[PDB]
Structure formats: structure tokens, C-alpha cells
Design an enzyme around this catalytic site. Structure first.
Site, PDB file in Angstrom:
ATOM      1  N   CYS A   1       0.822  -1.280  -0.099  1.00  0.00           N
ATOM      2  CA  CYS A   1       0.016   0.179  -0.007  1.00  0.00           C
ATOM      3  C   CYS A   1       0.972   1.364   0.086  1.00  0.00           C
ATOM      4  CB  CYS A   1      -1.087  -0.072   1.080  1.00  0.00           C
ATOM      5  SG  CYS A   1      -0.283  -0.154   2.870  1.00  0.00           S
TER       6      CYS A   1
ATOM      7  N   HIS B   1      -2.886   1.808   6.801  1.00  0.00           N
ATOM      8  CA  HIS B   1      -2.892   1.741   5.460  1.00  0.00           C
ATOM      9  C   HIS B   1      -2.490   2.907   4.831  1.00  0.00           C
ATOM     10  CE1 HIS B   1      -4.347   0.541   1.504  1.00  0.00           C
ATOM     11  NE2 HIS B   1      -5.573   0.476   1.916  1.00  0.00           N
TER      12      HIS B   1
ATOM     13  N   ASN C   1      -8.613   3.746  -3.169  1.00  0.00           N
ATOM     14  CA  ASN C   1      -7.712   2.562  -2.546  1.00  0.00           C
ATOM     15  C   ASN C   1      -7.100   1.817  -3.613  1.00  0.00           C
ATOM     16  OD1 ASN C   1      -7.028   0.687  -0.546  1.00  0.00           O
ATOM     17  ND2 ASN C   1      -9.142   0.008  -0.141  1.00  0.00           N
TER      18      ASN C   1
HETATM   19  C1  GN9 Z   1      -0.473  -1.759   3.513  1.00  0.00           C
HETATM   20  C2  GN9 Z   1      -1.660  -1.847   3.860  1.00  0.00           C
HETATM   21  C3  GN9 Z   1      -2.356  -3.326   3.711  1.00  0.00           C
HETATM   22  O1  GN9 Z   1      -1.753  -4.213   2.990  1.00  0.00           O
HETATM   23  N1  GN9 Z   1      -3.198  -3.892   4.571  1.00  0.00           N
HETATM   24  C4  GN9 Z   1      -4.080  -3.178   5.374  1.00  0.00           C
HETATM   25  O2  GN9 Z   1      -4.290  -2.090   5.616  1.00  0.00           O
HETATM   26  C5  GN9 Z   1      -5.058  -4.213   6.082  1.00  0.00           C
HETATM   27  C6  GN9 Z   1      -4.688  -5.437   5.484  1.00  0.00           C
HETATM   28  O3  GN9 Z   1      -5.197  -6.593   5.658  1.00  0.00           O
HETATM   29  C7  GN9 Z   1      -6.338  -6.765   6.791  1.00  0.00           C
HETATM   30  C8  GN9 Z   1      -3.603  -5.272   4.536  1.00  0.00           C
HETATM   31  C9  GN9 Z   1      -2.456  -6.124   5.058  1.00  0.00           C
HETATM   32  C10 GN9 Z   1       0.725  -1.838   4.559  1.00  0.00           C
HETATM   33  C11 GN9 Z   1       0.850  -3.261   5.339  1.00  0.00           C
HETATM   34  N2  GN9 Z   1       0.745  -0.863   5.558  1.00  0.00           N
HETATM   35  C12 GN9 Z   1       1.842  -0.248   5.866  1.00  0.00           C
HETATM   36  O4  GN9 Z   1       2.959  -0.575   5.049  1.00  0.00           O
HETATM   37  C13 GN9 Z   1       2.010   1.029   6.890  1.00  0.00           C
HETATM   38  C14 GN9 Z   1       1.883   1.988   5.883  1.00  0.00           C
HETATM   39  C15 GN9 Z   1       1.785   3.483   6.817  1.00  0.00           C
HETATM   40  C16 GN9 Z   1       0.236   3.612   7.192  1.00  0.00           C
HETATM   41  C17 GN9 Z   1       2.344   4.679   5.928  1.00  0.00           C
HETATM   42  N3  GN9 Z   1       2.932   0.336   7.673  1.00  0.00           N
HETATM   43  C18 GN9 Z   1       3.540  -0.469   8.385  1.00  0.00           C
HETATM   44  O5  GN9 Z   1       2.527  -1.553   8.228  1.00  0.00           O
HETATM   45  C19 GN9 Z   1       4.668  -0.367   9.120  1.00  0.00           C
HETATM   46  C20 GN9 Z   1       5.877  -0.527   8.315  1.00  0.00           C
HETATM   47  C21 GN9 Z   1       7.132  -0.852   8.873  1.00  0.00           C
HETATM   48  C22 GN9 Z   1       7.528   0.563   9.763  1.00  0.00           C
HETATM   49  C23 GN9 Z   1       8.108  -1.084   7.796  1.00  0.00           C
HETATM   50  O6  GN9 Z   1       4.715  -1.529   9.830  1.00  0.00           O
HETATM   51  C24 GN9 Z   1       3.770  -1.596  11.003  1.00  0.00           C
HETATM   52  O7  GN9 Z   1       3.035  -0.642  11.450  1.00  0.00           O
HETATM   53  C25 GN9 Z   1       4.411  -2.818  11.909  1.00  0.00           C
HETATM   54  C26 GN9 Z   1       5.525  -2.742  12.643  1.00  0.00           C
HETATM   55  C27 GN9 Z   1       6.840  -3.037  11.952  1.00  0.00           C
HETATM   56  C28 GN9 Z   1       5.705  -1.372  13.359  1.00  0.00           C
HETATM   57  C29 GN9 Z   1       6.812  -0.918  14.178  1.00  0.00           C
HETATM   58  N4  GN9 Z   1       4.277  -4.026  10.894  1.00  0.00           N
HETATM   59  C30 GN9 Z   1       5.036  -4.566   9.883  1.00  0.00           C
HETATM   60  C31 GN9 Z   1       2.687  -4.522  10.375  1.00  0.00           C
END
Ligand code: GN9
Ligand code: NA
Length: 254
Positions: A31, A201, A221
Site C-alpha cells: 500500500c 494503510h 484505494n
Molecule cells: C499496506 C496496507 C495493507 O496491506 N493492509 C491493510 O491495511 C489491512 C490489511 O489486511 C487486513 C492489509 C495487510 C501496508 C501493510 N501498510 C503499511 O505499510 C503501513 C503504512 C503507513 C500507514 C504509512 N506501515 C506499516 O505497516 C509499518 C511498516 C514498517 C515500519 C516497515 O509497520 C507496522 O506498522 C508494523 C510494525 C513494523 C511497526 C513497528 N508491521 C510491519 C505491520
């Protein structure tokens, strides 16, 4: 500047076909990369007066940005926009269209909703390798297909500042907190009512409006056209709903 009651980037800049294109991140937490390359595609076209009318490659950014996080396991907005400024991003369409330097390797799937694609399910693909090679039919070398920005920035957590930014310079990337009820969204103006957090997200804000006195943001989205309102959703505007006004990032080519 006076802010209109409604604004739609698709109607202000209709020559820029990226603005009305809904993508699919597939079985991958990319995303962060999709919201980035979508808004960068839009802004490259808008800010060049239609000269740079391209679809930038999600997989180039996903696979090659080291500072952006964990690829298909998730990522970070600021570094994605910094990568576009410093290294740039090549062209590439969806898997099905197979156009540009580096088209997306993963197929369309349904993200917890009904429709005509296979369900995404719960498993995620391995992050693709950083290949640095255009597809055989594309006759520009990878490095020479790179599109770069000049600046990147976070946008102030202020409704009018976000509206001014979108209407002058184009769609923005934004983060928000996904709760379980977001996965039940079919249509209308979303707000969090039930369910626990599923993390963050990243999406693309294209405009705003109001219906029955309820203000909203209009958002693309990256879960294909079957999801939500033909791939879009609306969310309450003006109350930092799910932190929608607090993680806005964008950038300019000049
Ligand atoms: C894209 C969003 C997505 O794929 N999905 C959803 O929103 C709901 C879903 O399924 C039910 C799917 C999986 C991704 C997953 N989201 C992100 O990359 C966010 C983006 C921010 C909102 C800008 N960030 C994270 O997920 C983040 C990324 C790390 C810092 C590399 O990670 C987390 O929040 C945690 C954790 C590492 C936090 C310290 N983890 C990896 C989920
Ligand atoms: Na739908």
C-alpha cells in the site's frame, strides 16, 4: 484561496489518465508504494502540463527502496517520496496490461469483498528482487526510464492546508489507522464504529465533497475496482478520523 465545497482531481486534470486509474497491490503489503507511485504519476503529469503522462512502477519502488521498510511486509511514506526525488522511479503498469519498463508481477485479487477476481486470502508473496531491467519489449534502458521529483514534504495536519495542496499541486498520499470495520466497507462515508486496529494503510486523496451536510475526503484505494465505490471510498473530513489528516505526504517535480 477560496476552497470550493467539492473538488475532484479527475475533473480538474482529465488529460492525466493516471488520476482516474485504480490499481491492485495484490497479496502484498505494498500500500505504501502504491499510494506513492499513484500520486507521483498524477503529479508528474499535472505539474508538467501533461508532458510526463506516465504510469510509474510500484514494483521498482517496492523492491529497490532500502530505507522504505520491509517491501511486501509494509513500509514508510517519507522515504518513498525521498527515493522518488533522489533515485526516481521507472514506468510500469499492472500485471494484466504488461506495459512500461517494470510492470507489477502480482495478479488482481479480492481484498475481503465479493467480486470477479480470486480472493486474496491471508498469505503474502515474497518481496520481489530489485531487478533494474526493463521488460524485453520496452526499448529504454532501466536507468534512462527513471522519473524523479525535485522536493518531498509532509503536509500540515490542517484540513484547509490539505485542500489547498491537493487543488494546487494534485493528489497526495496519506496514511490512516485501519480498524476491522473498514474491511466491511461497501459504500458511503466511512467512520470507525466497531473493531480493533489492523495497523496502518496508505492511500491517495484525490478530492473532497459533502453529502447530506456530512463532509468527506474522496480517496482512491489500491484494492481494485470491485472494492468500495468502484475502487474509491469516502471518509469523514475535518475531525482527523482514523488519523487521516495527520500522515499526509507529497512532493513536486519543480
Ligand atoms: C499496506 C496496507 C495493507 O496491506 N493492509 C491493510 O491495511 C489491512 C490489511 O489486511 C487486513 C492489509 C495487510 C501496508 C501493510 N501498510 C503499511 O505499510 C503501513 C503504512 C503507513 C500507514 C504509512 N506501515 C506499516 O505497516 C509499518 C511498516 C514498517 C515500519 C516497515 O509497520 C507496522 O506498522 C508494523 C510494525 C513494523 C511497526 C513497528 N508491521 C510491519 C505491520
Ligand atoms: Na464495490
Amino acid at each position: 484561496v477560496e476552497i470550493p465545497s467539492s473538488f475532484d482531481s479527475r475533473k480538474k486534470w482529465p488529460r492525466c489518465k493516471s488520476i482516474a486509474t485504480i490499481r491492485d497491490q495484490s497479496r502484498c503489503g505494498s500500500c505504501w508504494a502504491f499510494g506513492a507511485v499513484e500520486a507521483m504519476s498524477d503529479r508528474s503529469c499535472i505539474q508538467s502540463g501533461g508532458k510526463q503522462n506516465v504510469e510509474l512502477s510500484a514494483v521498482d519502488l517496492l523492491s529497490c527502496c532500502e530505507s522504505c521498510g520491509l517491501g511486501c511486509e509494509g513500509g514508510i511514506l517519507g522515504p518513498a517520496w525521498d527515493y522518488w526525488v533522489k533515485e526516481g522511479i521507472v514506468t510500469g503498469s499492472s500485471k494484466e496490461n504488461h506495459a512500461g519498463c517494470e510492470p507489477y508481477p502480482f495478479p488482481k485479487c479480492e481484498h475481503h469483498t465479493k467480486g470477479k477476481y480470486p480472493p486474496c486470502g491471508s498469505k503474502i508473496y515474497k518481496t520481489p528482487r530489485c531487478k533494474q531491467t526493463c521488460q524485453k519489449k520496452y526499448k529504454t534502458p532501466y536507468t534512462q526510464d527513471k522519473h524523479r521529483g525535485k522536493s518531498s514534504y509532509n503536509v500540515k495536519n490542517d484540513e484547509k492546508a490539505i485542500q489547498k495542496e491537493i487543488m494546487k499541486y494534485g493528489p497526495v498520499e496519506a496514511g490512516f489507522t485501519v480498524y476491522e470495520d473498514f474491511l466491511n466497507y461497501k459504500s458511503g462515508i466511512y467512520k470507525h464504529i466497531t473493531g480493533e486496529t489492523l495497523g496502518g494503510h496508505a492511500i491517495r486523496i484525490i478530492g473532497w465533497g459533502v453529502e447530506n451536510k456530512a463532509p468527506y475526503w474522496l480517496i482512491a484505494n489500491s484494492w481494485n475496482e470491485d472494492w468500495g465505490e468502484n475502487g474509491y471510498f469516502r471518509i469523514v473530513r475535518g475531525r482527523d478520523e482514523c488519523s487521516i489528516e495527520s500522515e499526509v505526504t507529497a512532493g513536486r517535480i519543480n
